[PDB]
Design a protein around this ligand. Structure first.
Ligand code: HEM
Ligand code: RRM
Ligand code: CL
Ligand code: CL
Length: 394
């Protein structure tokens, strides 16, 4: 049968809470049903084991999403030529090339630049005097600087492509076309950058990708451009969301902030714990479609149906994490799926971990008395969650 399709997503947008419907879903035997704003209805997987099977078992596909009206919260399905929309062997081809610039070995040399950037930003916040906006004055410039210089997109255009990002991630039903319109404008902008790099190469990933295209014929011109778009958006928006949400969690329960003040060596383990607890997205991971008939948590997923994964819910599955709703900065074997799991495991994860570690490290060192100093504007009707503006003091 088909359980009553529930209104998805659930919410909320404020705080780090997960809708009670997620808890009721994990407790329910089998997979529940959901109806996203656009597209067909699909199953929702919320249990850790069930989530990891849909994410990492080759019997599920991301490529099959183009021959379906995929469940989604945004009207426009760009169908980008990115590795995330493909299966093997195409995914393997793209990921093998682009991953080289994002491994631990590759980004570790960036830690000093990030560290110094954070302290320089903190110098400016101190000089100006409280209050400061922890987003615009800290959380945003850090990841934006890194990705611009890694990718090769001018830092001075961040306002322009920031505005395009906001429209591309909006789920507001009003202006239901700004997304597709503004992504096309972003297509033209990125095309202009790629053209300039092909003309006059530089020491950035775009030039490296051009070379792999023009010389090695390892990817199409379309693949090259869509990866530039995704890397630029994820490169700066994701970390800009997590930094202020992480700090909010540590300040909300100030024992956590104090432990890190006393034991900075715990920062890596703490960052992992917060990646498990702090939700990035407002909904669920992109749909996976079953290539054959298979059983997922008691339910028989029908070959051809979409299964969504509630990563934040599976990260709070009490069957895998003791006291799932508590923050344990020293949680052992903390194999959360905050960065996904399997074939499409987050490629920027080494870079994201580094950025969060250094972002926190600098605040703890310089602003131990940090305190929220006003109303926190949270993101609403966007594909991601977190403080839009965060007034802070010290
Ligand atoms: C807090 C920061 C971040 C979080 C929480 C995060 C989370 C995730 C998750 C959960 C996935 C898999 C989604 C799914 O399977 O449905 C993913 C994939 C991906 N992420 Fe991230 N991400 C972050 C930052 C970044 C950054 C900075 C980059 C820079 C390039 C990036 C690039 C990618 C790419 C390319 C993929 C797809 C890889 C593939 O399909 O094989 N992410 N991320
Ligand atoms: C190479 C592409 C990797 C995409 C991942 C980014 C991280 C993550 C983690 C789980 C989150 C719930 C989703 C939320 C979606 C985000 C951040 C979308 C961003 C935007 O669409 C970027 C990727 C633009 C691409 C473009 O080509 O215009 O984001 O999951 C992935 C996004 C899934 C999406 C966009 C599902 C959907 O809404 O159908
Ligand atoms: Cl545990
Ligand atoms: Cl494991």
């Amino acid at each position: 049968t088909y359980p009553e399709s529930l209104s998805y997503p659930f919410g909320p947008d404020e705080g780090l809470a997960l809708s009670e419907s997620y808890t009721r879903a994990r407790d329910t035997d089998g997979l529940i049903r959901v109806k996203l704003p656009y597209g067909e209805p699909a199953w929702l997987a919320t249990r850790y084991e069930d989530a990891r099977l849909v994410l990492g078992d080759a019997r599920f596909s991301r490529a099959l999403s183009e021959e379906h009206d995929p469940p989604r919260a945004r009207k426009f399905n760009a169908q980008a030529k990115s590795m995330f929309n493909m299966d093997a062997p195409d995914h393997t081809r793209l990921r093998r090339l682009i991953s080289k610039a994002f491994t631990i070995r590759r980004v570790e040399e960036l830690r000093p630049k990030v560290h110094d950037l954070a302290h320089r930003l903190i110098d400016d916040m101190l000089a100006k005097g409280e209050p400061a906006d922890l987003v615009a004055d800290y959380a945003l410039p850090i990841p934006t600087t890194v990705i611009c210089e890694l990718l090769g997109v001018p830092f001075e255009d961040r306002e322009k492509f920031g505005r395009w990002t906001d429209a591309i991630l909006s789920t507001s039903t009003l202006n239901p076309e700004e997304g597709r319109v503004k992504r096309m404008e972003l297509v033209g902008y990125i095309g202009g950058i790629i053209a300039a790099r092909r003309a006059q190469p530089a020491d950035d990933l775009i030039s490296g990708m051009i070379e792999a295209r023009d010389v090695q014929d390892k990817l199409t011109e379309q693949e090259l451009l869509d990866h530039c778009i995704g890397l630029l958006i994820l490169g700066h928006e994701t970390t800009a969301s997590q930094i202020p949400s992480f700090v909010y969690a540590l300040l909300d329960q100030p024992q956590h902030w104090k432990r890190l003040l006393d034991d900075p060596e715990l920062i890596p383990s703490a960052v992992e714990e917060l990646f498990r607890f702090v939700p990035l997205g407002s909904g669920s991971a992109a749909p996976r479609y079953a290539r054959e008939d298979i059983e997922v948590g008691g339910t028989l997923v029908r070959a051809g149906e979409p299964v969504l994964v509630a990563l934040g819910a599976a990260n709070r599955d009490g069957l895998r994490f003791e006291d799932p709703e508590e923050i344990k900065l020293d949680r052992p074997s903390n194999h959360h799926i905050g960065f996904g799991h399997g074939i499409h495991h987050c490629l920027g994860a080494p870079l994201a971990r580094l950025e969060l570690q250094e972002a926190l490290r600098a605040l703890l060192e310089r602003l131990p008395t940090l305190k929220v100093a006003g109303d926190i504007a949270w993101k609403s009707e966007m594909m991601v969650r977190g403080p839009r503006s965060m007034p802070v003091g010290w």
